[PDB]
Amino acid sequence: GKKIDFLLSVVGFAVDLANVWRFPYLCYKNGGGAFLIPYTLFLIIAGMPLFYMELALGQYNREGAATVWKICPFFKGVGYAVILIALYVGFYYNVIIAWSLYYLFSSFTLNLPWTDCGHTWNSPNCTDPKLLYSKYKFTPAAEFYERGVLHLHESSGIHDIGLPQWQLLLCLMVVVIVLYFSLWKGVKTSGKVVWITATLPYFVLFVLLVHGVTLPGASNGINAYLHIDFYRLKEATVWIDAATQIFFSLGAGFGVLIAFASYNKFDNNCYRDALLTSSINCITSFVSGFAIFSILGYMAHEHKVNIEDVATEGAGLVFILYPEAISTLSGSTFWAVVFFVMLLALGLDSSMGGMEAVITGLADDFQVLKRHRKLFTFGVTFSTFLLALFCITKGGIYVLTLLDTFAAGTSILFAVLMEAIGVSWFYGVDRFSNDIQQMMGFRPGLYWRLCWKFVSPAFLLFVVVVSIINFKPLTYDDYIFPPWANWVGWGIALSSMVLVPIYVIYKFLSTQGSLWERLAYGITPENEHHLVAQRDIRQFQLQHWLAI
Ligand SMILES: CNCCCN1c2ccccc2CCc2ccccc21
Ligand SMILES: CNCCCN1c2ccccc2CCc2ccccc21
Ligand SMILES: [Cl-]
Numbered sequence: 001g002k003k004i005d006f007l008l009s010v011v012g013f014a015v016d017l018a019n020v021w022r023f024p025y026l027c028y029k030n031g032g033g034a035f036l037i038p039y040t041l042f043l044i045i046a047g048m049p050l051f052y053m054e055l056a057l058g059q060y061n062r063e064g065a066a067t068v069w070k071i072c073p074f075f076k077g078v079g080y081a082v083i084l085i086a087l088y089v090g091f092y093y094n095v096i097i098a099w100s101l102y103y104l105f106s107s108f109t110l111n112l113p114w115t116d117c118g119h120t121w122n123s124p125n126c127t128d129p130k131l132l133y134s135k136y137k138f139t140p141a142a143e144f145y146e147r148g149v150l151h152l153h154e155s156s157g158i159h160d161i162g163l164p165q166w167q168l169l170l171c172l173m174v175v176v177i178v179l180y181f182s183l184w185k186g187v188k189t190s191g192k193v194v195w196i197t198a199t200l201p202y203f204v205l206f207v208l209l210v211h212g213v214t215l216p217g218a219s220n221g222i223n224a225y226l227h228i229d230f231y232r233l234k235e236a237t238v239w240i241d242a243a244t245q246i247f248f249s250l251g252a253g254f255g256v257l258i259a260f261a262s263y264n265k266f267d268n269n270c271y272r273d274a275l276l277t278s279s280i281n282c283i284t285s286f287v288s289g290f291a292i293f294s295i296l297g298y299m300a301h302e303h304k305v306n307i308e309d310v311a312t313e314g315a316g317l318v319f320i321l322y323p324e325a326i327s328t329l330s331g332s333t334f335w336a337v338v339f340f341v342m343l344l345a346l347g348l349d350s351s352m353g354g355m356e357a358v359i360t361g362l363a364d365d366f367q368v369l370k371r372h373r374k375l376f377t378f379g380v381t382f383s384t385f386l387l388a389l390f391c392i393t394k395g396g397i398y399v400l401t402l403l404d405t406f407a408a409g410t411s412i413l414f415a416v417l418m419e420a421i422g423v424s425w426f427y428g429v430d431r432f433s434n435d436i437q438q439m440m441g442f443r444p445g446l447y448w449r450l451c452w453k454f455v456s457p458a459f460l461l462f463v464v465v466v467s468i469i470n471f472k473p474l475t476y477d478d479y480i481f482p483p484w485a486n487w488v489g490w491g492i493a494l495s496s497m498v499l500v501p502i503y504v505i506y507k508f509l510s511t512q513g514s515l516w517e518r519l520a521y522g523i524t525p526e527n528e529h530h531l532v533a534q535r536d537i538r539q540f541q542l543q544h545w546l547a548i
């Protein structure tokens, strides 16, 4: 029972909405097979060491994202930046959950709305194969998603977003109420119904893959998925996408792993947890991509169109694909209900931890918030609800893609780079290894220390610089955003990227003493401050820097 429960818990925390929603369309947009090489390379090199480092930091220091930086007082800015990024992500994460809830509600019927067109929301240009370079957007499923759910046809761009959709408004209200009621009592919510939610996604994926393999056109989709277009590997768009997807999917760099590890037993094995989580993450992503490409190859065969134009490359790819596969299953209503219930539960569980990260990180900084978890939870949830209500307008898909591109991109890459730089170079990679040994009893291997100190920061810096210099103006299918939209996106990214120097300056000015005294007080652990007067600072000697 001990091992099975641990395996189930790890498996349940891996698969999450990132894996089943964001990876499909990021892989499709990048050609499929060509997206796996950068994905796996970054997975190993950055994700595994950073996941392990965040787990170890949280477990040892027993502090949230903001307060964990008592070891290096200058990086509370990094803590605040990751907290802000976590706050930003929820705005559109909850909107995706609302879409899932809407589809679940719409699935309750014997005639699924996305099977054949002719409804009130269908344009005259519909084309139903059964009844008779553009992304199409004229099939029954695409028409349904883009008109009867988003009502995107009523917006001409990001400058004409319009008023919130009342149906999506109600769905967002329900999602937010569920989140609050599941977050107000405390952080302990597991061990009750995780059994069903820890296995339903994998069963759904298994049946979907088994059915998709045996479809008229799945062979072409699989061939495209496995084919690697090496010309795509030299543009840096695939590399930026892979890095951002790896850090969003693993959960490293959002301040959530630190907060959750703060509650772990002091003897808990972070190495095993990181290894298993990364392995499951990779395997699930690969299988999901396989199934997605099989389904879209079937669609290409059925729609008499090239595989590169069957469905959109935006955030609605899964909501346009999975209904198509479901319609091909016997008793489609039951399968649709099961699939969308699975999606809703998965999203709710993921978003719960995502918001708990911010709640705990901010509470650990001010004790008043910790003493009033209910009111603080309500405030955070209400702010998220309003800023997401901004994203369920008629032109809300444009704002959603703006956020999905600029909220956790270069911002999280810079935050994780600064986390690694701070911890390793300033605190001491040898000190971190000593803490890990004191916790689990064994010291990290040479590979982990090398990744923490040299390999991971180098790759992260390269990715950040390339993303900053190689920037593509935003587009959504055939829509090209106005320049001020790109400026607003970069401002959103900078809002979190810039908290680091601001806090460094603030700490330098607030500190009292001489320049060397200021640096000593800024690069020394708070509980270790009293050695500064004695003037033995390990950060001022070459040995601290050359340690490995
Ligand atoms: C024994 N506790 C740690 C394992 C479960 N734990 C994990 C597992 C993998 C990665 C992160 C975490 C963080 C805390 C958490 C939250 C919910 C379920 C499992 C876990
Ligand atoms: C792990 N992939 C992302 C899953 C959701 N994600 C959320 C959700 C809502 C708000 C913030 C975040 C930040 C990243 C994170 C970390 C841990 C669990 C979920 C999430
Ligand atoms: Cl992923």
Ligand SMILES: [K+]
Pocket (backbone or CB within 6 Å): 013, 014, 015, 016, 018, 019, 249, 250, 281
């Ligand atoms: K995941």
